[PDB]
Structure 1
Amino acid sequence: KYIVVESPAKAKTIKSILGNEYEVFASMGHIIDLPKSKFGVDLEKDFEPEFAVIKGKEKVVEKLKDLAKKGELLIASDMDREGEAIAWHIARVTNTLGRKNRIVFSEITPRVIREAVKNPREIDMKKVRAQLARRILDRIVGYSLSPVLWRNFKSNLSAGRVQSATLKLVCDREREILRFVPKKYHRITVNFDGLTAEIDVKEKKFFDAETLKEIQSIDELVVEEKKVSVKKFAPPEPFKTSTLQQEAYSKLGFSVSKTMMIAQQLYEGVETKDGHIAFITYMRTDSTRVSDYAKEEARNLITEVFGEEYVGAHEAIRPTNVFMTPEEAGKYLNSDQKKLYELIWKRFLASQMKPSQYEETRFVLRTKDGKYRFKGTVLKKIFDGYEKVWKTERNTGEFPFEEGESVKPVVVKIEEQETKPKPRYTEGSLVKEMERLGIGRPSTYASTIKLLLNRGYIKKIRGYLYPTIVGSVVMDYLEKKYSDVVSVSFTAEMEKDLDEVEQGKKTDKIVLREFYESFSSVFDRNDRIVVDFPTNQKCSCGKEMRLSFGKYGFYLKCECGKTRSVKNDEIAVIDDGKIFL
């Protein structure tokens, strides 16, 4: 039998497992694709795609056709929609579509691979159609709007729908920050015996001088209320793509593209001095489910290392072999791979362990004159559970006081503060928002963010993301002329529709016809657009400046002073028609 995969890494890992009973072949990427500069879909044949062998890949195609005549040609592409389409192109070119020739697995390990090759299935055409519909949607937007956007702002909308929705998130965040009005208030805390409590107020308040003097004068309080209860904390869930990207960003400082690159290495199998080893399950997943076999191995490890009292077709991202500890993994993994494997391993083991248990004491203290109250909480650890693996800090302490008892000495701390706006997104917290709103999917979170940064539509400064002049100006255009079509809401609706096509709950054709109706009814190909915005900038003579766009790109001008040039990626947000630089 012959097995075909996309990558040399996967081919070597698979060949290591199967030996000489199977010949394993890598295609070295895609063989067939839509045209690179023809539109490629026939809008008069109900969105018929036009495929051709990619230049340079003709020989691979010939080899595949030859193999298919010599033996069963099994296809071991990754298990996502893209992989299913790869499988379909190979089956079509070899005239084997409909055979049981597609191998499905979430991990490249001996037990799993050996079973998977024995149980091939037919290519899932609903999954293929969901992929193709995505390609067609992107191609319609891309080939309609990128020329319009080149003519007017010298920039493009590839990865389009999802990319414009995500850009909108960043702009909306920036306007929220712009419009925020901070409020001064006092933070007032009392401190006694290692415990703290905050003043009890209906809203954040700026106290007057005489009230502050009084509060600062407090040196004794009385316990008004003491309530003790059991508090359990759930272990983390096993990673899925979205939460891996978020945590690798916040815990390791990895960009979401670096995380996915490393995760792919760990899944496909790394070459070692002695062979090849897969470390984790497939990295594009929306599931946090764990196989029964992996659950059992985890129970066995927990039992052995920690004790029984600690024990708690898409799959979570998790270690293929939980007994390969992060420390042992270090002899095979580079520094970045080791950090990522360690994260994944700790999250998985912790997810299989018992909740932790604490006793929580919530208390209220009052002054003797009854004028002021202060509220606090403290925890006491009963059982660490999963926190033995997933490191957690909590406000632990003791409340050695009863209701009605006086406490002295107390120390009051008064600090003037100002309310703060929402923080900007980071790559990780932008992924979180894309998941929240339904606009990203496992295969598109990282690529969307990367493209936005690469086109200079957003800019990263000390890890926070800012919209730029070109991002803002492009988004404003799309909002004005393609309001419904480019909305976060419509993007989310389309992504849900494509999930439904994959699941066989909607047809590709119905989804495509709906989109095209909405798009075509607003698409104006001959649109010419003079950039002309009021700004928050002033020139020497006192006048307001205006933003314009010429042969050397963006510039500011006033009906008096000289013209100041601006880079496409200078930070900027548009609000009520005015650009704020």
Structure 2
Amino acid sequence: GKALVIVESPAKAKTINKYLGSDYVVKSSVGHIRDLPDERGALVNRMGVDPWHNWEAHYEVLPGKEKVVSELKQLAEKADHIYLATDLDREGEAIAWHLREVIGGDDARYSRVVFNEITKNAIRQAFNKPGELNIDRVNAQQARRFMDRVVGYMVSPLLWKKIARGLSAGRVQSVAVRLVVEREREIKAFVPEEFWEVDASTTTPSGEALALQVTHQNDKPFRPVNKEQTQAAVSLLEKARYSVLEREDKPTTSKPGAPFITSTLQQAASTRLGFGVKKTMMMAQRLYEAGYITYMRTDSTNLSQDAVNMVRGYISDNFGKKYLPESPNQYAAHEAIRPSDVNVMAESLKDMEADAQKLYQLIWRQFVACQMTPAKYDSTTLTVGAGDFRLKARGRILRFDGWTKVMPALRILPAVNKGDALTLVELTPAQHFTKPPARFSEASLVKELEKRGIGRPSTYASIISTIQDRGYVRVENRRFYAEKMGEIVTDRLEENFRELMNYDFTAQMENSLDQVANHEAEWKAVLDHFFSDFTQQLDKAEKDPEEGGMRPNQMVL
């Protein structure tokens, strides 16, 4: 009469099993078990969903999954209750749904356990008050896959006939590419502008060196545009008398960032560790399944009181009172990506390759740092007057490292009083040129997608990978480049699928899927509205170019 517990991977099973008594029998589904394969029976067949028949779906068991199916049913009868312990997100919710449909039986036999980490306490609480499968979330998850399937299978064929065979269309992927093609064109059309800067080396009364940057000439910002203007300014600066007009000494602080969420974890892992989005999410996943960190698909910077209290204890013991804030820091109930146990160091992780330990370390330090006091600096700003010019010297000295103490080990302005005379040693004119917009990176793109409300913790990685192996954009030197085909398709889609390509409408769809997940909308009605708009767009696109249809990629003579 033992209880059955189902998870989606052997790894999770392994870990969760350590915290489940003998009353439980943990089993992995090993994959999704089941999923998908003016109406056209053949189109509907390929899609596995019927837009013209109220979104009737045809879910099939994946290859070689019937064995696992019969393995679960068999274990299901022997169990008095079935616990679907899939991941906490919608996809996890849908997988749980599919397992229940297959294994069949009374709904009362099923509980949906949710937990953001696989630890003794988290599993305890998760299995103490088991919840029910949330059909709204399942519907929100299926609504998403149905529309993605629709766009994919209905827009792609049009692309094959108008542009090229094999091209793919993606509800969100095409919008993502659009961001890259837009950036590509801003860069292409950028005309670098020349501007100059003049730095001045001076000596304080006490003989110390003081590097100054000219900021103003005649109270207006100093922005010479060419060599002649710079020379004229330089010959004036060469004869001027330098003196400190203002000495601004102010205490400043730097606060630690918020604990990681999916998008910032990917950004930081990419910038600091050079890790790609896929690599990061793959390692993050293994760390989560091994019970080392909380769920890695989140956009919440929340930290549980237990997590906060465990880290504050670590900070007090290992860093001291001055690094412990009066009260815990709170940022912006899911959780941030943090270690499951702060006392587990990156070096102590079992069966994790070097890079996964490094990701853990990144996550660990960010988590610890986020609960530490601010770093304190004594900032100094010197405003120097030189005839009609004003020069600036900015300095900074660390007064208290605070949170930076958990980060790896790492300009001193000389002492000058206002009114002091400075001696000019040398003037250095430097030619600069405005730089075109930076190219999207592994990080900055997810960030841009997060910013525009387009992505989603559990889609960022997928979106980034999907737009790459299909000839639209390519990553070179850890940077995105839009391919000719990416621009060609993006122009076609913007012209004939404007609503589908619109950033706001795309962000709004995410809101609409969230409305479904929160019982504020009904999935089929949301799918109907989407399909209505979609088909209207699609019908015009299929027409001849002279009818306002999509332009073929021909270059007629």
Instruction: Give the TM-score normalised by the residue count of structure 2.
Output: 0.89
Distance 1:203 1:190, change over 3 A: closer
Distance 1:227 1:140 in 2: 62
Asked whether the equivalents of residues 84 and 110 of structure 2 are also in contact (C-alpha less than 8 Å), the reply is no
Alignment pair present for 1:261 and 2:269:
no
Distance 1:215 1:20 in 2: 86
Distance 1:215 1:12, change over 3 A: farther
Paired position in structure 1 for 2:373? 354
Deviation of 1:410 after TM superposition, in Å, equals 4.3
Paired position in structure 1 for 2:384? 365
Alignment pair present for 1:475 and 2:490:
yes
Deviation of 1:324 after TM superposition, in Å, equals 1.3
Paired position in structure 2 for 1:316? 336
Paired position in structure 1 for 2:552? 530
1:381 counterpart SS class: strand
Q: Which runs of 5+ in 1 are unaligned?
A: 270-277, 534-547, 549-558, 560-581
After superposition, give the CA deviation of every residue in 1:303-359 in whole Å (9 maximum; x if it has no partner): 111102211321111111111122333x64311112111111111111110111222
Partner amino acid, structure 2, of 1:81: R
Paired position in structure 1 for 2:97? 88
Aligned equivalent of 1:301, options 310, 314, 330: 314
Distance 2:91 2:239 in 1: 67
Paired position in structure 1 for 2:547? none
Alignment pair present for 1:108 and 2:129:
no
Once superposed, what is the RMSD of the aligned Cα atoms?
2.2
Deviation of 1:444 after TM superposition, in Å, equals 1.0
Once structures 1 and 2 are overlaid, which stretch shifts more, 374-383 or 281-290?
374-383
Deviation of 1:19 after TM superposition, in Å, equals 4.6
Deviation of 1:194 after TM superposition, in Å, equals 5.3
1:153 counterpart SS class: coil
Deviation of 1:216 after TM superposition, in Å, equals 5.8
Distance 2:66 2:457 in 1: 31
Alignment pair present for 1:325 and 2:345:
yes
Alignment pair present for 1:59 and 2:67:
yes
Distance 1:42 1:519, change over 3 A: same
Distance 1:463 1:59 in 2: 42
Q: 1:375-524 to 2 correspondence within 5 Å?
A: 375-391=392-408, 396-524=411-539
Distance 1:213 1:205, change over 3 A: closer
Partner amino acid, structure 1, of 2:191: V
1:74 counterpart SS class: strand
Q: 1:235-314 to 2 correspondence within 5 Å?
A: 235-269=256-290, 278-312=291-325, 313-314=333-334
Aligned equivalent of 1:11, options 10, 13, 22: 13
1:9 counterpart SS class: helix
2:455 counterpart SS class: coil
Asked whether the equivalents of residues 219 and 408 of structure 1 are also in contact (C-alpha less than 8 Å), the reply is no
Partner amino acid, structure 2, of 1:114: R
After superposition, give the CA deviation of every residue in 1:202-234 in whole Å (9 maximum; x if it has no partner): 363225254144156258521112222221221
Deviation of 1:280 after TM superposition, in Å, equals 1.0
Distance 2:425 2:309 in 1: 52
Distance 2:380 2:119 in 1: 48
Between Structure 1 and Structure 2, which shows a larger proportion of helix residues?
Answer: 2
1:417 counterpart SS class: strand
Distance 2:480 2:402 in 1: 37
Distance 1:411 1:503, change over 3 A: farther
Instruction: Give the TM-score normalised by the residue count of structure 1.
Output: 0.85
Deviation of 1:47 after TM superposition, in Å, equals 2.4
Deviation of 1:515 after TM superposition, in Å, equals 1.3
Paired position in structure 1 for 2:353? 334
Deviation of 1:406 after TM superposition, in Å, equals 1.1
Asked whether the equivalents of residues 100 and 120 of structure 1 are also in contact (C-alpha less than 8 Å), the reply is no
Paired position in structure 2 for 1:575? none
Distance 1:125 1:392 in 2: 50
Deviation of 1:434 after TM superposition, in Å, equals 0.6
Deviation of 1:409 after TM superposition, in Å, equals 4.5
Asked whether the equivalents of residues 162 and 439 of structure 1 are also in contact (C-alpha less than 8 Å), the reply is yes
Distance 2:26 2:343 in 1: 28
Asked whether the equivalents of residues 76 and 103 of structure 1 are also in contact (C-alpha less than 8 Å), the reply is yes
Paired position in structure 2 for 1:30? 32
Distance 2:435 2:515 in 1: 41
After superposition, give the CA deviation of every residue in 1:283-320 in whole Å (9 maximum; x if it has no partner): 11111111111111111111111102211321111111
Aligned equivalent of 2:164, options 153, 157, 160: 153
Asked whether the equivalents of residues 223 and 363 of structure 1 are also in contact (C-alpha less than 8 Å), the reply is yes
Distance 2:312 2:449 in 1: 34
Partner amino acid, structure 2, of 1:327: E
Deviation of 1:99 after TM superposition, in Å, equals 5.2
Asked whether the equivalents of residues 375 and 403 of structure 2 are also in contact (C-alpha less than 8 Å), the reply is yes
1:489 counterpart SS class: helix
Aligned equivalent of 1:174, options 159, 184, 195: 184
Partner amino acid, structure 2, of 1:82: E
Alignment pair present for 1:141 and 2:151:
yes
Q: Which runs of 5+ in 2 are unaligned?
A: 38-43, 203-207, 326-332, 545-550
Distance 2:310 2:210 in 1: 42
Highest RCO, 1 vs 2 (Cα 8 Å, sep ≥ 6): 2
Distance 1:215 1:363 in 2: 21
Q: 1:175-214 to 2 correspondence within 5 Å?
A: 175-192=185-202, 193=208, 195-201=210-216, 202=221, 204-206=223-225, 208=228, 210-214=231-235
Report the number of matched residues.
521
After superposition, give the CA deviation of every residue in 1:348-399 in whole Å (9 maximum; x if it has no partner): 11111011122222221111xx211112322232221101113586xx4245
